[PDB]
Design a protein around this ligand. Sequence first.
Ligand SMILES: Cc1ncc(COP(=O)(O)O)c(/C=N/[C@@H](CCC(=O)O)COc2ccccc2)c1O
Ligand SMILES: Cc1ncc(COP(=O)(O)O)c(/C=N/[C@@H](CCC(=O)O)COc2ccccc2)c1O
Lengths: 359, 358
Amino acid sequence: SDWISFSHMSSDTDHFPIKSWFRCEQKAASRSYATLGDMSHPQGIYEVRAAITRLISLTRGVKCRPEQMIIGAGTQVLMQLLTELLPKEAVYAMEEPGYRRMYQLLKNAGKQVKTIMLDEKGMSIAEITRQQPDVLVTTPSHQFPSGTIMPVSRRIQLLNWANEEPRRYIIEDDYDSEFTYDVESIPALQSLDRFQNVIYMGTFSKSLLPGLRISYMVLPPELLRAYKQRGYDLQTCSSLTQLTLQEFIESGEYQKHIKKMKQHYKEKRERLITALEAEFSGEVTVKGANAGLHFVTEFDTRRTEQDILSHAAGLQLEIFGMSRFNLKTGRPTLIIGFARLKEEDIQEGVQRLFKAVYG
Amino acid sequence: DWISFSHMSSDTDHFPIKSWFRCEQKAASRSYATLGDMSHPQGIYEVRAAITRLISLTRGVKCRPEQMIIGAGTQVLMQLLTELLPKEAVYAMEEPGYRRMYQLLKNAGKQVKTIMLDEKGMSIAEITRQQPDVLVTTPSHQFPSGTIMPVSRRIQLLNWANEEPRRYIIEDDYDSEFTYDVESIPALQSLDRFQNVIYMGTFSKSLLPGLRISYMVLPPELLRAYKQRGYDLQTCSSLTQLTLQEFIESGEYQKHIKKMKQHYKEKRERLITALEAEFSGEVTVKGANAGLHFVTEFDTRRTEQDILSHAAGLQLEIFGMSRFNLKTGRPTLIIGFARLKEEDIQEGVQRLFKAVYG
Ligand SMILES: Cc1ncc(COP(=O)(O)O)c(/C=N/[C@@H](CCC(=O)O)COc2ccccc2)c1O
Ligand SMILES: Cc1ncc(COP(=O)(O)O)c(/C=N/[C@@H](CCC(=O)O)COc2ccccc2)c1O
């Protein structure tokens, strides 16, 4: 019962300011108790969309009114709605490797999904023009999983591509954008756009706890119109949660958590990358480590990825391989999530991995 | 100021918010370590078990935790459901019915047949003739009509489902918690032989509408279909699921439902009393045995839509029965009584008289 986690699917419980979250919950519950008897506006409580709208416009340069926002019980519930609002026969394009869960969702709605390989600047604009889709889904802040940060040149190329023809859209999945380490934040695709072909998506999962389940998208007027024409939708976030968040942002706590955690995860990432280069001696390559809460390790070895996982499992080390992110070569890679990982476990973790890779 | 007869509204005053927060803090510490991990996709095991125990006591639903899927309101579970059912399915809903679910189904491509009501719920005459694959029904308190489907028809429906393959029943037990001067009745799922019921429930009505915690129990066949996906993520907040586990397991839920059972019984009376006193036999009350609303038909020249605009003119929030048509010289209105304060009964009852007539 003594595991260590390099899992990317997990967060620190110890570092979340939970006592502050509950304080904001009470402050917020008292001020609006009245209102929790009525069901929330389908898009989300106005003031909550307002609170989120200021923040992302501050932290990422997103241009939007709160009327354009939809909240939010996780991305898949917004992405599902979004497919229902984009044209039924529209052809989707995802990164390769990609957020496989979203691929599976798109396939499960029987949508055609082309897959775009990546280059040094991220999702390839050559492959996009070659494969001629209608809807890109891209992770510019920290490509998931490869880690690549999309430079501004490529952001523009994608944007030019989207207004060459009508009925083309970009879904900017800004997952894991809150932290960026030895570079400055690049502002969002959505900020650079002048023609409103971007659907900006975000989540508080990464910056709070995975267990909270509050995410949001910003819809361009055309698609917002489409949303409003359905009439039947019902909000998926608990109103108390929506309000707790509101209060957690406005009070300044969220902004304070972000600054404290930015520092904490920068130090843990240094510690960990230093540790890895040490007990792997250069047999390792470390990729995509300037943002997010994971990076890639590529190892020099015979052993099949699948066996390293079995061995790692054997040594009580939770860990995942890159093959997981294939939508559709003897250098196996792993994903190293440094969110839950305690600093006492670093050394021991970097040992267990060296034994898992060799034995 | 306003007086609400909205069926879309609820307690606040009569919901133990400090207890809720107490169960939360208790659950929060007992399980703090586990909030760094995402929930099991079907919902936290301990929380499904808690709900699985409760629904067997309160409704006679017999099932394993493993078959339950927790989600953020019925809509999201309903969406999931359609993706698990065959894909070309033909659906069938009560007419009048839950229009939002109608619109979700049309919108999703589905052929959806409407099905008239008789004195004992969803016709079955209609069902057998019109030959659909999937039924959606509301046995405990029809939405909107308020008819309590009795045992005989629950049997009829099961037998319809039982006597041919690939027929399903969606048992939408919305608004079950309360039955006043009558017996509560076993659910279709509990009377089921071959597992062709999908029992769906929700905590929206018994807690606050705000909360967003609902559940559906799947047949093995469909559960194997859910597991073949393997991408879904939970939509309920882990804290909320844990707070709900604590609310049920500590007796505070059971307590709350008893508290509200009495408080809603004596406030349903004080209302009908006042209506049949401020009208006479000019008001017919229908479907007022279960749930948290009834209907009222009014003998009057004014159409439904004039009676609303005049009642809305008097700050009296109210919704009409034509809202629930999927597709008369007697108008009929829905009378939610969950929010309604007692001091406003007599005065709302009056404001409705003047908006019926002039
Ligand atoms: C690329 C990408 N984009 C968006 C999301 C959105 O998450 P949502 O809004 O919260 O529903 C995820 C979640 N991805 C999940 C793993 C995916 C996988 O590898 O199977 C992991 O999510 C979390 C991990 C740690 C802490 C908190 C959350 C995404 O990997
Ligand atoms: C038939 C039926 N089945 C299920 C549900 C439950 O939806 P869920 O709460 O998201 O799981 C409702 C809620 N229907 C809503 C809309 C009615 C309308 O369209 O006018 C009314 O819901 C609430 C009202 C007060 C307090 C709590 C809920 C349903 O009318």
